[model samples]
Target chain A: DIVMTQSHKFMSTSVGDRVSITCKASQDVNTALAWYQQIPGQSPKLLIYSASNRYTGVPDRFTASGSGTDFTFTISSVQAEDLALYYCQQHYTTPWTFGGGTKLEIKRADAAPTVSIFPPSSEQLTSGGASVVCFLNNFYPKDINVKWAIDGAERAGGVLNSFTGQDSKDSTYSMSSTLTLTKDEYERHASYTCEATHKTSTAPIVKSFNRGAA
Target chain B: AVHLQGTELVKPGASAGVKLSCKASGYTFTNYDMNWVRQRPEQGLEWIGWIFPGDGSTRYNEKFKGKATLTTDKSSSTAYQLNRLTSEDSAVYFCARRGFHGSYSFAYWGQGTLVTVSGAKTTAPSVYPLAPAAGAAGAGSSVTLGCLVKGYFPEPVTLTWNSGSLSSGVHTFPAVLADLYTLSSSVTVTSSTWPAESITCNVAHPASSTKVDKKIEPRG
Candidate 1:
């Protein structure tokens, strides 16, 4: 396989900001590289071909450079329509390969997630164990760190996180995490807390559930 | 929104020439360019040639310069004709339309036409679902999974991820050995979603109607 590795997973930018995306091939592919732009819900469009040459009708801001194994695609002045995922592909040999896409997100006012944790319901508590769910919503740009802890000790296993897609109406993101605990462990009266860390805030948003209350 | 339909299979006997047509719809056929790509049995895809349907201008890969011809009827179809057929010409040919809106990418591709040469036997491909690569299997935000299809003849195999065609994966036709072809496809997903359930790699080959679905166990 002609592996194409795209290092950046996502880049945040504003209109008119300059952006560059890079791709590295496993071996020398000369100038046979092509760059593509995939707007959401649309097919990928080729922007630059033969490594650095702009394809027919492509805008002048979309330029590329480099040869052999390393190549870079740059947008001199990003436009609002340019907020899309970018991919690099190598057509030099068999089994054409594309890089892990880089999502170009338009930078907006950071929004911190609202965190909430629900105690195990009566039905859930009787299912051999207790399943505690922690939910966070209305966040921007997707990335967040969430964890569950008993008092201050981190809990590892029985933890599942669901990072959902952007909300269509507001363009914000939401996520949920579930932590399973044994019946005996759930009755210990220990404090269970869910903490969420995001770029919008320096401190984590914390929510706690205490079985001791009951 | 471009749609291209091509002939399914063509067997015109050895030493005989064949004309393959790619009928296009949903777009003006003459406003853009059309390309013909070839996959030799077990080998990777090679761009054969391309045609400017509006001006009748054409260009070809050096390897297919004298062996292939490209033309358009100025209506709604482009045609490719290959002459001097031999065992080497037995492969799948695909016709694609180039996109000129903002970028010049081949956004639409026709279901390929398989050309089988006489005296060659058909072979069904064996499918294998592979775990993530070393560095990719770790506790990262995302994971990549692969599907290997090998030892097949007439090399046109379709792959799907969990019953859906893979939209963001990479396909590699590694090589051909002793009349058999080997290729692989891969897709990446968030680590949290990967282990929720097993992902299936389904391979369908022209040699047989029965399909192979290899389940990929989630990473531990």
Candidate 2:
């Protein structure tokens, strides 16, 4: 059984950006490779067969190159519809195998997530503690990194970050991160911040919560 | 029905060269690619090659590199040519249209053409003439009759209606069995003749050196 390997599990590209996905076989396959594009929730479509030959009805924007053990599939200019998983397979011998697919994520220009902090409710302070919430809304791609900091120091515990947004109708995602604080920490007037890093922005968006603001 | 009709039977001479043709109907032929497959007796199938009908570009299997050549014509037909014939080259050759998806599946297949290397053991086909369809062509005045010829070898056989060929409204498909070969032919008759007319299917086989005829008659 020949092994086919694709190193990248996820690749990021924006509209009109060029993208290349690579696959390497354990041995020479002599142009007996094929590339497939599988949109989420749909069957995989053949884009290239025999390594470089495009399949019937496949657009020329999707191209393939390389031979033997090393092969690459290229998209000349990425389109929104082109965001999907791509796979490469070898049909040279028995036990034909497919490579681990690379998921194409489209980084849209207008999909930056808006970050804001919601202070703890008054009823929570009467119970001797409070929890601060950070909301990240309207992000295009689902992936993001969230960090919590207290008094300018990054803290790992007492923080609960929600899973990436599941969009509804508007086609955007929303997420929330919660930080729990004790009565002593709330009374000390320590500054708490939520930092979110997403693909659409050059720097992380930080939203602060303080006792003075309340 | 979209049809990809293949040549019925091909016999290669001592020189060992033959072109097996597949004719397409009911669809735009140039929009798809056609592939040739071979099945040897009871064994599995092998891919000979494929041709893109639009531009005539072709790709072949490494196993058939020098043996098979693929081509297409303007008449919405594709042909598979074998350069040389050997004992191992005897098989049923099929032309299958590439399906709409990319997973190496065929959407349509021709009733396969049997290629015999001439001089192999031969089998004579059994002929059967089927009854006409119920009540003729349903409010129309025509009825179509069928003749089935199966289990043939050495590939050559002659099929005729009333001992002669029909000029119109007759369709004969290629032989398509895996090991042996089977052929079917149909001819349409008008209702003006009704039950008063009789139909006979004649089959002539070189292997049996005999002409066999089966007659079908209407019964109450």
Candidate 3:
């Protein structure tokens, strides 16, 4: 069994900045490598695999490329949402090991306010009536809002739920939310969106979604 | 010379709990302790914990927290039990000898029971639309994203999203069934205007400070 070590307890930067974390394997792990991000109280999302190859829907800006005994996971053009703890793990052998993780923070830039979006898509139902869920990538401050709206209108009165994000490496933050609806309601071509706002910015960033074709 | 041995298939959705037997092959069974571990499908291995057939003393991987239960029967000189059982748990489970120095890691490992969690019984109904509808709307367009996780029960989960631009938000919820012990969560987000962006889903447990995220891309 090999041990993994991650440097930097906490990381701080301004919006649009770039950051990186290094994961070293106690022994040679070959190329079986992976990187993941975790907000304070949420589950870890896989960022890089096999040392590279971003997962299916990962953004181009969030790039992962490395190999051999050492590897690197980088987030290009960091945003407020990119603030969270990051980790590295070796998949080469049994009793895999993971780095403690690096916390990413926003530097509070004085540039024009950019709107943060949430719930980029609408909820879809599985034939069994399960709700679809979504998440925001590496964001910071730990305290952000994600809401839903239907076809150019707010979903009546939307509700928000919060949880404790982790502080593994440094004082980084992360959180989550949930909503429920009937299958038929989703079929009506409903769209969903997630937005984030702060005292420094006036416009909220938003991501929207709708039902898929039948 | 004690040895643990077993075999199983990489079946789908089948809770092929690791079936193992300890054979005190060359040495006395009571002289050494036995334990089991799990590896992610094609990924790294995790310490599921260990059991002492001698006195039934046991310990678990903090990351495994409540996902697995370790037990043993000294009379049989054989230890047995089951894991929380999830798709993620669909890796090789091995029996090892607890080091005499109070250290972890297995010196001898079973060939490993290769169990996969996928099958008719475990297949989720395609109730959720695979793709989002066309020409929905932007920024203000209403939308929602939901996710489901199987395997370990009672784990905490949450979902979040971010527009490629600057706006983003996060949401979280507790597992619906505590005893079900499957650490899973679902969420929905609605907005009038949609942005060309990305959405993410994350799951976490007290056992480890790790967050698993599932990112979704905005439809053109």
Candidate 4:
């Protein structure tokens, strides 16, 4: 049996900076090791295998070195995007072991997800009645819930929402929910609200915009 | 030969526990080892764990231990029991006979069973801020503009960018602030060119029935 251990609780850095994290095995693992990066909002990706070879698609800045009992996973130049939780594993042993996980936190912090509403145009209704889009943006961890409530009640038809994805720049994220309702159903309602909830926050961010007469 | 019996879908809640059980037949009940492999949502292939039906001895992937359990039943066939299911666990799971259908080198195989998990936290990716979210370039200046996304989970989602071709993994996530993560990708061009509205980031999730498509629109 091989035990993978990462003693560092957290490694701090910023973009352009570089950092190296270590993992030690209880026994000789040869080179049968794989490292993973669990970035926020993203699935954990395998970084390296067999001690040195990089996983497919992994950036060159990220490198893995060593074998036997000790190993290191390094990022030559850390970008704002490089801060994440790192884990080590050894497949050479039964129950292939994984290190608890070492978190690489960026200096700055994440704020609660913020949201807004984009009112639908009566004229914009190409075929269906007017549509409303609730935009959920700039939150961390990307795990959020956004729903549409009409006239103080949930609608029979559901809001079309997608799981969060990492943004191409600035590192923040955004998602929208579109509610399709007939002109009569939308205008007839007393009020409409879009509610968003994050797992850690008890408060839900809600937004809504009304469409007056066409 | 091995035969697996199980349904296609399994939904469990977040921070909760659920069990996935697969029954095996056709092979000598205790002769070969039974292995469980997973294809998480959109990703290709992954190995979960394996159980030796004879002694009920088990070996799991470092990432799957504690998260999944391997068990056996002497009477009929081998049983693969996986617990603590999550949205990330939503995918196609298959139970195959080792040395015949699994990696220790076998040739036989079984059909994959689809597992759709719910009630867990599934982050939705924001559309790339493209609606004309492009950078300045000329008739031929190698201008670059693309989608920006942040805050999401269950990494295997798909992001399709069209100028002509769709790129899946060229994108990168550099930071993970606890639960939130940031990812960035760019597209460059020097041509008759990409219509401002032509670029888009179409996000797909394994657990969600609907796909979110955010676009970059063009101006007249």
Question: Which structure among the candidates has the greatest TM-score?
Answer: 1
Per-residue C-alpha lDDT of model 4 across residues B102-160, encoded as one tens digit per residue: 12422233455666544436675544343211223323443334444444554445566
Please give the range of 10 consecutive residues that has the lowest summed lDDT in model 2 chain B.
B131-140
Q: lDDT for model 2, please.
A: 0.68
Candidate 3 residue-wise lDDT, B43-112, digit = tens: 4435566666566587766677766777676555666646555656655565655333332323344555
Tens digits of per-residue lDDT for model 2 on B1-220? Answer: 7677888676664446677888887778888877777766334345677787787688777777677777788674655555454556877787766554554544466777877665435787766554432324323476555565655776668888877745454445545533446565656667565445777888899877977887755421
Task: Report lDDT (Cα) of residue B99, candidate 2.
Answer: 53
Per-residue lDDT value at B153 in model 2:
74
**Interface RMSD value for candidate 2, one decimal?**
29.0
C-alpha TM-score for every candidate? 0.49, 0.38, 0.33, 0.38
**Each prediction's whole-model lDDT (CA):** 0.69, 0.68, 0.51, 0.60
Candidate 1 displacement at residue B101 in angstroms:
19
Model 2: which residue pairs collide? none
The weakest ten consecutive residues by lDDT in model 3 chain A span A111-120
- Candidate 2 true-interface contact recovery: 0.00
Residue-level lDDT tens digits of model 3 in A1-214: 6878776766666568788777788887767777767564333566666777676567887776666777788888887677887777675765556676777765532332122223223333343233434344334454456655667675534233334443333333433443444566655646665555534356766655554432
CAPRI docking class of candidate 3: incorrect
> Model 1 interface RMSD, in angstroms?
15.7
What tens-digit string does per-residue lDDT give for candidate 1 at A1-214? 6888888878877678898888999989988788878654344576887888887778999999999999998999998788788878787874456787787876666789766555554443564556566657668868888988987898888775555445434557666666767777888757889999898888888878566453
Model 3 clash tally, residue pairs: 112
Which structure is stronger by TM-score: 1 or 2? Answer: 1
True-vs-predicted CA distance for residue A46, candidate 1, Å: 2.6
Give the per-residue lDDT of model 4 (tens digit) for A46-125: 67767887755778998999889999999999976677777787767566556767777554356575454444442434
Candidate 4, after superposition: displacement of residue A58 in Å?
Answer: 9.7
Candidate 4 has an lDDT of 0.60
